Amino acid sequence: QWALEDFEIGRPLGKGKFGNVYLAREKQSKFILALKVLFKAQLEKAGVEHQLRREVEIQSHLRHPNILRLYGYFHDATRVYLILEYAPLGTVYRELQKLSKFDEQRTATYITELANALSYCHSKRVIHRDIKPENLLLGSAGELKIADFGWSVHAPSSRRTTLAGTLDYLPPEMIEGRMHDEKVDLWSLGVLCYEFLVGKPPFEANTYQETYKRISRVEFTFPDFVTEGARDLISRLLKHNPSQRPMLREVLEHPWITANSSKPS
Ligand SMILES: Nc1ncnc2c1ncn2[C@@H]1O[C@H](COP(=O)(O)OP(=O)(O)O)[C@@H](O)[C@H]1O
Ligand SMILES: Clc1ccc(C2=CSC3=NCCN23)cc1
Ligand SMILES: [Mg+2]
Ligand SMILES: [Mg+2]
Incomplete structure (x- = not known):
């Protein structure tokens, strides 16, 4: 055609x-x-x-x-x-390079738009699996848009194909080749929320070999300026055990989210 x-x-x-x-x-x-x-x-x-x-x-x-x-x-x-x-x-990637860090209102608003988008996806049992700033785009009114569905699938799933570049956004079960589900996108949501507020992702590291180590160990610390409510949300999403990660409905009605986001669910 x-x-x-x-x-x-x-x-x-x-x-x-x-x-x-x-x-x-x-x-x-x-x-x-x-x-x-x-x-x-x-x-x-x-x-x-x-x-x-x-x-x-x-x-x-x-x-x-x-x-x-x-x-x-x-x-x-x-x-x-x-x-x-x-x-x-x-891209959201570009915006982060521009401003270095996002404030709490901007971060919370992006998280809400994301959690709405992923919620819709999971309701067809579609998991994206490659959520990161280069794959998040911005509309004419500045609204967030998920893109690049190359790595997406139906759950449950194994990983059959080779991870190419950065490990920074992937959960322990996925790097270790185990099987996985919807909960992988919730780990990635935690990683993003940290990076939005701090300027760098929580397990960032000089070598592949070390990043792998920090992720499987869940080794991250907060700068002093990260508020208690943000700390609470991030700590809940970055759980080694997938089943312990919250549901998207809980993210959407978390106190720090509702207090700071300028968009509804
Ligand atoms: N619809 C679009 N509008 C504006 N920029 C885009 C669009 N799609 C992709 N880009 C830019 O091109 C880059 C690569 O696109 P993407 O579809 O993610 O390719 P790949 O699958 O190779 O990662 C994105 O990070 C973004 O900067
Ligand atoms: Cl090649 C091409 C040309 C037009 C469209 C289109 C998608 S939405 C829409 N509203 C009006 C036209 N249009 C898509 C592809
Ligand atoms: Mg891409
Ligand atoms: Mg791709």
Whole structure:
């Protein structure tokens, strides 16, 4: 149906491991969107065709204001092209580099939008598994949007494919290759909330080998400026035992959240 010919391409919006994402406008409708480009050879060399298919299937059928839309796809013997909703205010990653740390109101508001988004996902037993600042985008009114569903699945699950880069956001059960469920996204939520307030993730470390050690041991400390209510929430989500991690409904009505977030559930 669609092809390269139907689009005028604009400036680069970002780069990922496989993905190279561009601003683009559809010629007849003048519709502005984002074009995620993937090189078939690398997709094959790494054998992650199944991830791409998972990404397209899951993201196209989801509908939530805090989840990034995927409108379709096409391909052309060297490349695959994913047609995405354009997020005009960029990544949460960029915003963190800009401001160094977020205040409590900003942090709590992001956490609420996230927990709403994940709640919707878990109600279809979809687990995202790759929640981090580069994969969180911002809409025109500054609202948070989860994106990049390459690693997502239905639960329960084992990990069949190789973890490529950073360990910083993954729970103990996932790095250790065990099986896992919805609770992995709740660990990641804890990691984010820490990083939003402090400027760095709680198990950050100079080598792969050491980060692995700090995560399986749950070794983290707070700077003095982190308030008691934030400490309470984070300590509850970063539980070694998945079953001890709270439910999203509890996160959404935690006192520190309700006091500080400017958005409802
Ligand atoms: N819809 C979008 N709007 C704006 N920027 C985007 C969009 N999608 C991706 N980007 C930028 O491109 C980067 C990589 O996109 P992503 O889909 O996460 O690729 P990968 O799967 O390779 O990580 C993101 O971190 C972001 O900076
Ligand atoms: Cl190539 C292309 C062109 C348009 C759209 C679209 C998605 S939502 C929407 N509301 C009006 C048009 N439109 C998607 C892809
Ligand atoms: Mg990504
Ligand atoms: Mg990906």
